[PDB]
Amino acid sequence: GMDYQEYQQFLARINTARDACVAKDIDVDLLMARHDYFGRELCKSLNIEYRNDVPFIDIILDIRPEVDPLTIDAPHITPDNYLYINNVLYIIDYKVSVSNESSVITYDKYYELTRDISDRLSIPIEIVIIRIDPVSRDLHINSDRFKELYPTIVVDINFNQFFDLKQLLYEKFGDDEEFLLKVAHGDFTLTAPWCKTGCPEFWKHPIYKEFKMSMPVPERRLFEESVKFNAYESERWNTNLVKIREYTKKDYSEHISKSAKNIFLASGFYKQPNKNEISEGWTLMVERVQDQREISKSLHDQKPSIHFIWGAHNPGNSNNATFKLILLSKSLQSIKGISTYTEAFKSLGKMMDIGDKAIEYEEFCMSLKSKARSSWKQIMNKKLEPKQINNALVLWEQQFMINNDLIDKSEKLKLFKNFCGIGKHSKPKILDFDDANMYLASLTMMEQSKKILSKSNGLKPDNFILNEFGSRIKDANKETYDNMHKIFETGYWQCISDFSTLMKNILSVSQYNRHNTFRIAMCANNNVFAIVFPSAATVVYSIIVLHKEEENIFNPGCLHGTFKCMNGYISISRAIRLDKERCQRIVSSPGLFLTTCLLFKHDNPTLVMSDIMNFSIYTSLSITKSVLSLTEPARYMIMNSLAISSNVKDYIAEKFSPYTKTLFSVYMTRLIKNACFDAYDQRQRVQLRDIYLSDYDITQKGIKDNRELTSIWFPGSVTLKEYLTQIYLPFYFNAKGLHEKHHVMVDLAKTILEIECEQRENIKEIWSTNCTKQTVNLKILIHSLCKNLLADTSRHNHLRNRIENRNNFRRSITTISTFTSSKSCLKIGDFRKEKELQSVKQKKILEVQSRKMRLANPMFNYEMLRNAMPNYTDYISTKVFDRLYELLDKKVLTDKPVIEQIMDMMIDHKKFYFTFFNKGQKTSKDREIFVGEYEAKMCMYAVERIAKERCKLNPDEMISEPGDGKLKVLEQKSEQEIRFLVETTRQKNREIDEAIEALASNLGKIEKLSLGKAKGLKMEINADMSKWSAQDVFYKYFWLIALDPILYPQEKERILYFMCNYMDKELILPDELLFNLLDQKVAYQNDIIATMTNQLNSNTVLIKRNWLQGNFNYTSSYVHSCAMSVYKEILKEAITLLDGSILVNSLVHSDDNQTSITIVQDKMENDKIIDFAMKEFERACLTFGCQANMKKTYVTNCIKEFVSLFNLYGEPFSIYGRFLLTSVGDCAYIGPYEDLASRISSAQTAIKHGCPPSLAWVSIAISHWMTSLTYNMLPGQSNDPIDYFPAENRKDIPIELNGVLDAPLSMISTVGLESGNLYFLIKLLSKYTPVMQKRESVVNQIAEVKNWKVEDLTDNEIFRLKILRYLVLDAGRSILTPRKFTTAGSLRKLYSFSKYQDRLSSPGGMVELFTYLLEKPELLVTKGEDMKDYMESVIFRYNSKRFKESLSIQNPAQLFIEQILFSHKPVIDFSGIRDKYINLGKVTFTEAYRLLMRDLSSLELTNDDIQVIYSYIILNDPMMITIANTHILSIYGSPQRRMGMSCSTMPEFRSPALVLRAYSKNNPDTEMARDLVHLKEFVENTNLEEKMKVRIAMNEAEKGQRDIVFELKEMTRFYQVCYEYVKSTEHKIKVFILPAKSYTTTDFCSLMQGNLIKDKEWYTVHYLKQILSGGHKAINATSEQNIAFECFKLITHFADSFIDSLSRSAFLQLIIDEFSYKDVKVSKLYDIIKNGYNRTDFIPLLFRTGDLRQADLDKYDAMKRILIRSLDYLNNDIFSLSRIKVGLDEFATIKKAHFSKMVSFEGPPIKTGLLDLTELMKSQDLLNLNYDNIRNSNLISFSKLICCEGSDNINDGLEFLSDDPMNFTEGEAIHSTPIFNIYYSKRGERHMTYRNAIKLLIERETKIFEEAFTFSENGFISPENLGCLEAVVSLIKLLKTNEWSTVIDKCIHICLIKNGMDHMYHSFDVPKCFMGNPITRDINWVMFREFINSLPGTDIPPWNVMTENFKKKCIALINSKFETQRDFSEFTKLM
């Protein structure tokens, strides 16, 4: 990026400097260094000459020197650069800054002065100031004339390297306040106050009394003093803040020492995990569980592991519906024996008989299905009636009627009372997992499963996934394709998939399942069936299977019993009562399952594939809560047990509680138990990779991947990365929303009331010194607040200004999202009236639904609560957008500034109320959400937001960093430590290491000195705080508001009052919880809920110290940061004692914490400091009121846990798996494209977090599978659109119609779904383009499109383009989307929806809205900027029936079934499809394909229509421009192993609602005026201004009068398509893990491309031309130049690196003339360099050719006193093209380029004795700049570099190679606790030249070739063998020159030239033996043939296989020559 020379000198100046005024100048010099750097590279980007601080009076003299500068008055300014074209002078003053505030100042200053001579000379002078952003990198130019000149400018600039120097300078001097004084943009500017008057009540409040009670009396007054302090009044802002700092400095200075001095007190005794410590924990766990749960040893109490019973399919019987129905009927009737429900199952088969009348079932059912398939809506009013067939009364296809005559009254009861459990109505029941005869039973269940499921399907291993994605999986990694087959083949896959396909059909049936009906559900298996019994939503089902022989059935613990029938055996499973939410997951279980297996097995050959799948079905299908209780606690139980410092005992003895209800759970528990002990013995089995560090980051970082560790869930060995996956991944198998709300509300309530009681009874004291639970070290707090509050205001002065802007404090409440959102909200008051009326309605609807059930199968309160509970404070649920509307209409909210309204609300609202609703997430331990009043939301907003922008300043806080941005931060901080550790070790041990190499004589004396030295120590505290919210003093936060400098006194009074009320805040127990406790039935022994509510009197309990979970994150997080800031100071004083160095780095995120400590020792042992660090860690937490959970907290020597994002020893790594398990049931079930959109987004996310392409593609397959399974769009399904459309396969069917996503992953990762459309257009620009222009930019290939011929194209090719233009372009672009008939639902709670009723009811008032909205069309798309505007927007919104539904929650489970059932019904309205073709009702999916073709065939494809596609898609979006370029200019290079992974940021490829108001009326309300100009162009170029008006203007003559509906609906479309153009998208933080650091776009592109090709090897990427094009106005000049630079940089270095010094000019001269780099002649590139204005870059090149003149030297010398003859003399002994002396010791620079580019050279061969330097250029292996790599290289690699034309003495011929020394890589151990070797590049000695390397290679490798090709006991001598050699090398020329043969020839050649036998080799033709007659050149193939067989061969590596293949090839080939398949008639003609 930047120059290396200036970096080194600026780094040294930071250490050299001591005083702040010296450090000041280093910051000033760094600005100019960046200033010129931007200018140097931009001048080449614009092709102009570079200049610096050139006077304006001289700039005119270049244009017109006839008038002298004295008489003509020119403005005396100092511009940077100038240009004169088109009779206009353009003045340049480039500058790099974040804001244009510094640019407009210099703009108007220049514009004013330049006008003095602008009218004097009558030549207009334009000011062109170019500014670039130093982080986001965006170009900003003010000149409009300059915009039209340069359409696109190349800006791949690097500031990343500049900020590295800034970090160093603001580290040493950043602590000193003398340096902070010098950096200022106003010193300190405090903005306008948010309030006018203070708060008197705050000083009176009893909580403020209680605050000062505990506090000491000097502190009491200080708090008074601090609040009343105004920062704007006193001379400086830090008057008070420093004053209170200096008071507490007595106790602080002492307490910092106190903690630090404990380093000597410590011992080598810390909570370390050990086999016994784990064992002890388990035993106390057993005791706990055996009390807390009812332990059972009986095998009848178990629950099903899986809720399914699979049995082998029967191919002998027919696979057809009607047949199976009767088959199961007779089968069920035929059941023989006696049980409980035997005669019940018997009659059920009897009630589904058809027999003779099989054909009547085929018709009757098809009529009913056809009746429903006609209508969009369901068939209402008409009564469904059954038809008597044999004994059964069929109601629908596979639906029957329960006939009360066919079953006994007693036998009907048995089935429903006992078996189905309809009418059945104290510890939990669990299985003893410590019983070996229970663990046995559990193991035998697995042994049983493996015995049956391992057996193959025997059916074709070809399903949609493999059929359509197999190709794209296989090419990524062939292993995974096979792995997939291995699964699909095995009964495992058929078992799950048939349960999936069966459940889909169980749900589909269960929807219309009545109370007098039992339904039958069949699957792809013709033995497996299911019976769905009447449900009293709840699905009641049994799996009924007809397995072959007895016990050829899989029972996981689900089966009721097997039964013998009259033909075979039939088994019926226990009645399962599951919920649709659970069942859904079972349907998507195969996708979950495949991923599980593939992820585990991936690239690990030691694992048993049949054992992975054996475990996987029991996970992917496990829907019980038994499993979650294992999967979650395991993650910590393993990691704790393999960490260094960690408390396992306590975690296993308290936090671990198995709920082993099922039988898999028992087996899985013991898998975990065992895995805990294996960890302890593997702690030291972890190794640390050899770190190849050579300045600016490291490649080959992180942990060593060694397969020495042991797996957890199955047998085999595993890698660390894989071990971690096996540890953490299990938890993501867990299922969401399993927690029954009835139980959650109780346990959530109980906990809050338990911890509040704790505080009420036990915790009384607030502050303390000894450090105790819920206590803060008040003196230490106040100081550490003061110190940080200073540094978080000194580093940014406008801090109060930044808060106002970024959080919209000044603007009206109606603008901020958090307030105008559709989130849940709590309303307080009295609703006893409507709450009673809303309840009794449902209590009647209860009886309504019961009355109807009494007729068919006779099986069978809010008033009470209010009457019973006296002190019941009444509340209600509402919406956040609705509350705002309510508070405005009743006028308490206004257009007053939101903060100004907040301040008043803090003092107005005095009592705060909060309610909780459960999340019920995948975790077994349930999480609560506290949601209270809207009034509260406003208060917390300010307090939290003020802390937000404060927290952002501190780099330690990470809640500030949105998205997965933390991952890179982990890395950047880990790398800083790995570097520091090395740097510091080399700085101390250098004195000792010198003596070691000196003596190494006797080695017995060396060990004495090698012991007594410095010792490295790294450690990471992977923390997790205990009860961050509940067990935390809220009183401490009062001080943060008090001490605050950027808060006014009248604000400070008001903030603290609200917080004073947030102590007397009440928790409302929601009614649903109170209803559970309403019906007593004997109360709880010790009822905590009743205790706190006084035997249930009030529904409110007061919560004090427990500030509610998530309400004060940032606030608490700043105090956390302040706490860890102390921990730093503690250790940093402790390590100065021992005399060494320490680097502590703390990452803070509310409750999740990570703190990395790196120490270089001298005195005491490493293990002492380990215990010391942990002591002060808890101390640091507890001195601030927070307590650290030592249970979950673990410490490693590498690993970093932080928010579950993991960084290893530099190498960042997340659990790629967790995101692949999302693409299964994560969608809103809207449409085929709409579903896939989010399912592929989940796959895109995996790639970010370092996922292999092979597995990435799997998710893409699964996603498609589920997507197509939802709407019956799979191959062979109903809506299968391959026959309906013209196409070969689903790759060619548009993804809008649902097909497959045919694109490269490197595109899908970037854009996705749209990629599939983009690839179909790039395919064309690689088919329908000529030989010229195709190799050039994409832009050029788009110009040729309008010169194509339409007739050339094919049916499919035409088909895409027609939809792509007439449909896709304008309409998340979908065409097919099913519409529903859903109802609005109950919207009574809403106030705002009532005001729509009143405006709809009263006549005229409706139209009045729409007529008002037409004069303000800004309020159709965006919400109002003012009260009325926002309010009336809310009412209009209700117009949409979709927005009315949006505020109601539909179950995705129910939504899923509704898209299956409504697929054969008319759902897609064609009206909205045909409208576009023209500019009936709903249409069925099948008909939608037909009716699309009837319209499509009519449309016309032109040479223009196609050119609109290539404009609107490619040429419009600068991103799509580059993506297409990257895939056309792509040149994939060297395949390499993924050694070093690094984090990389996604690059850039680039007023809202107020602008649209200035479009409605052209007058705005200055910068916003300029924004409308480009908006005018957008609407005029597309011409959508007229197109919209014409569409309305001709509709009023179509309809008749004035339709207000069309007046708006068409006007809204016009404003919504504006929104996307006007309101710009925020470039959110996206981090991709790549094989190296991506600085700029091009770098990112190359590394991204190469990461998503193969799994085993990543590839480095090249490009012919620049890929970064900006549009279709910008059509090469800037793409050419850089090629010339690359070329000559490459050549000069290749020449001075490898070619002999003596003959380097000749080489260059030969290369320049007859050669070409990247299809451009090197001469033309040289001419481009010579005609350029940066010749100073290529001084040594120009001198060597004789194209260097004095002007260049004079310029070069002026950039950073010379003569030509001086150079001519000086460089008489320096022979290099990359370097010439331009002084006494100053050499010239050529700037080295990478050597992976030399392949892009194409010229005639240059032969040098024997070597062909062209082939050395074209070589891959022999281009490394490492001596050892080339010395220890293969002869196969070198054998390409030989021609020799009969040379001699190989030693002589190698004279044309560099006899200059090469660079070797040396490595050394670092002497850390995690001991690793650093490897770096040295310069070797002298005898390490390129020649000697080649020679040593030749010698070593030829010796091995000789002994392999002896074929006798002689050698490479003895003509008896030379004859054999001649024979073997003869055939090689008379056969076929493939690739294997030629190598042998050239190797033999080499070997014979070496031995001095190259005076005959060239005169070696076929011997006399083989040649019958010498003259008559006849060949005896038979002889030759038998000669090849008669060759013995050798088995020495590496030639053993080489020779073997050669022989076979040559034999086969020879035999081929003979074998000529002649025509049968041919010979019959000749003779």
Partner RNA sequence: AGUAGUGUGC
| Interacting residue ranges for Zn ion, rule: CB under 5 A | 1844, 1847, 1953, 1958
1510 annotated as belonging to a binding site for a ligand: no
Nearest to 1796 by CA among 1829, 1819, 1827, 1826: 1819
Give the x/- contact pattern for RNA in 1642-1681, rule: CB under 7 A.
Answer: ----------------------------------------
Contacting RNA (CB under 7 A), which of 342, 418, 516, 1910? 418
Q: Which does 1953 bind (CB under 5 to 8 A by kind): Zn ion, RNA, none?
A: Zn ion
Query: Under the criterion CB under 7 A, does residue 299 sit at the interface with RNA?
Result: no
Interface residue with RNA among 424, 1442, 1628, 1765 (CB under 7 A) is 424
With beta carbons less than 8 A apart as the criterion, state whether 1748 and 1730 touch. Answer: no
Phi, psi of 1026 (to 5 degrees): -95, 120
Radius of gyration of the chain (CA): 41
> Tokens representing 514?
């009545």
Residues 12 and 32: their CA atoms lie apart, in Å, by 18
Rounded Cα distance between 1883 and 1865, Å, is 9
Site stretch for RNA (CB under 7 A), options 517-525, 574-582, 854-862, 1132-1140: 574-582
Q: Which is nearer to RNA, 540 or 1742 (CB)?
A: 540
Residues 600, 978: Cα–Cα separation, whole Å = 31
Give which of 1449, 1446, 1444 is closest to 1392, Cα–Cα: 1444
Residue 125 interacts with, from RNA, Zn ion, none (CB under 5-8 Å by kind): none
**3-state secondary structure string, 1467-1514?**
CEECHHHHHHHHCCCEECHHHHHHHHHHHHCCCCCCCCHHHHHHHHHH
Amino acid making up residue 558: C
Q: Give 1092 or 1806: the residue with its C-beta nearer to Zn ion.
A: 1806
Binding site partner of 1781, from Zn ion, RNA, none, Cβ cut-off 5-8 A by kind: none
DSSP per residue, 1249-1267: T---HHHHHHHHHHHHHHH
**Smallest gap from residue 651 Cβ to RNA (A):** 19
Among all residues, whose Cβ is closest to Zn ion? 1844
Q: Which is nearer to RNA, 120 or 736 (CB)?
A: 736
3-state secondary structure (DSSP) of residue 1095: coil
Q: Which residues contact 297 (CB under 8 A, 6 or more apart)?
A: 431, 432, 435, 437, 438
Per the CB < 8 A criterion, the answer to whether 1801 and 1818 are in contact is yes
Give exposure, 399-434, as e/b (b: 16+ Cβ within 10 Å).
bbbbbeebbeeebbebbbeebbebeeeeeeebbbbb
Q: Among RNA, Zn ion, none, what does residue 1844 contact (CB within 5–8 Å per kind)? A: Zn ion
Position 669 contacts RNA (CB under 7 A): no
Q: Is residue 1853 within the footprint of RNA (CB under 7 A)?
A: no
Q: Is 1794 annotated as a binding residue?
A: no
Considering beta carbons, is residue 760 or 1895 the nearer one to Zn ion? 1895
Binding range to RNA, per CB under 7 A, among 23-31, 634-642, 740-748, 1681-1689: 740-748
Site membership for RNA, residue 348 (CB under 7 A): no
Please, is 1201 exposed, middle or buried when counting C-beta atoms within 10 Å of its C-beta (0-12, 13-18, 19+)? buried
Nearer to Zn ion, 20 or 1843 (CB): 1843
- Total site size for RNA, rule CB under 7 A: 50
Residue from 160, 838, 1076, 1766 that binds RNA (CB under 7 A)? Answer: 1076
Residue 1436's alpha-carbon distances to 1387, 1412, 1440, in angstroms, are: 16, 11, 8
Tell me if 796 is assigned to a ligand binding site. no
Determine, following the binding rule CB under 7 A, whether residue 747 of this chain makes contact with RNA. yes
1489 is in an annotated binding site: no
Q: Kindly state whether residue 233 participates in binding RNA, applying the rule CB under 7 A.
A: no
Q: How far is the CB of 847 from RNA (least distance, A)?
A: 15
- Cα separation of 53 and 77, whole Å? 9
Q: Interface with RNA includes 1596 (CB under 7 A)?
A: no
Cis peptide before 1740 (omega within 30 of 0): no
Which parts of 709-738 interact with RNA (CB under 7 A)? 738
Pick 329 or 584: Cβ nearer RNA: 584
Q: What is the nearest approach in angstroms of RNA to the Cβ of residue 810?
A: 48
1958 binds, among Zn ion, RNA, none (CB under 5 to 8 A by kind): Zn ion
Q: What CA–CA distance (Å, rounded) separates 620 from 1062?
A: 45
Residues 1714 and 1723: beta-carbon distance below 8 Å: no
Does the footprint of RNA cover residue 1125 (CB under 7 A)? no
Angle between helix 1518-1528 and 1314-1322 (nearest 10) = 50
Does 1962 appear as a known binding residue? yes
| 1089 contacts RNA (rule: CB under 7 A) | yes
Among 119, 233, 235, 291, binds RNA (CB under 7 A): 291
Q: Under a CB-based contact definition with an 8 Å cutoff, are residues 1961 and 1952 in contact?
A: yes
Question: Which is nearer to RNA, 1076 or 1921 (by Cβ)?
Answer: 1076
Say whether 1949 counts as a known binding-site residue.
yes
Q: Residue 1071 interacts with RNA (CB under 7 A)? A: no
- Indicate the residue among 61 and 746 with the shorter CB distance to RNA: 746
Record the tokens describing residue 342, joined without a space. Answer: 């035997």
How does DSSP assign 1770-1787, residue by residue? Answer: HTTS---SS--BSSSS-B
| 1451: contact with RNA by CB under 7 A | no
Is residue 1897 within 8 A of residue 1891, CB to CB? The reply is no
> Whole-number minimum distance, CB 754 to RNA, in Å?
8
35 is in an annotated binding site: yes
Q: Is 945 in the site for RNA (CB under 7 A)?
A: no
Position among 889, 1087, 1445, 1469 found at the interface with RNA (CB under 7 A): 1087
- Give the residue with the Cβ less far from Zn ion, 691 or 1925: 1925
- Give the residue among 877, 1321, 896, 947 at the shortest CA–CA distance from 1119: 947
Smallest separation, CB 637 to RNA (Å):
20
Q: Which is nearer to Zn ion, 1447 or 1953 (CB)?
A: 1953
Q: Which of 22, 141, 441, 1090 binds RNA (CB under 7 A)?
A: 1090
According to the annotation, is 53 in a ligand binding site? yes
Which among 220-228, 285-293, 389-397, 949-957 is the span making contact with RNA, rule CB under 7 A?
285-293
Does 750 interact with RNA (rule: CB under 7 A)? yes
| SS3 state at 675 | helix
Contact indicator for 1043, 226 with CB cutoff of 8 Å: yes
654 binds RNA (CB under 7 A): no
Q: Least separation, in Å, of the C-beta of 1457 and RNA?
A: 19
1077 binds, among Zn ion, RNA, none (CB under 5 to 8 A by kind): RNA
Residue 1687 assigned to a binding site: no
When CB distances are held under 5 to 8 angstroms depending on the partner's kind, the choice from Zn ion, RNA, none that residue 815 binds is none
Strand segments, DSSP code E, in 1829-1961 are: 1865-1869, 1877-1881
In this structure, what token pair is assigned to residue 392? 């059964």
In angstroms, give the least distance from the CB of 742 to RNA.
4
Structure-block tokens of residue 1407: 């139209």
The reply, when asked if residue 21 is annotated as ligand binding, is no
Residue 1833 in tokens: 């290289």
Contacting range for RNA; rule: CB under 7 A; set: 86-94, 619-627, 880-888, 1463-1471: 619-627
Residue 1083 binds what, of RNA, Zn ion, none (CB under 5 to 8 Å, by partner type)? RNA
CA 1875 to chain centre: 32
At 176, list the tokens: 């000193």
Task: Provide the binding-site residues for RNA, judged by CB under 7 A.
Answer: 291-293, 303-304, 307, 418-421, 424-429, 538, 540, 560, 574-578, 623-626, 659, 661-662, 738-740, 742-743, 746-747, 750, 1076-1077, 1079, 1081-1084, 1087-1090
Binding site for Mg(2+): which residues?
1152
Binding site for Zn(2+): which residues?
1844, 1949, 1958, 1962
Binding site for Mn(2+): which residues?
35, 53, 80, 93-94
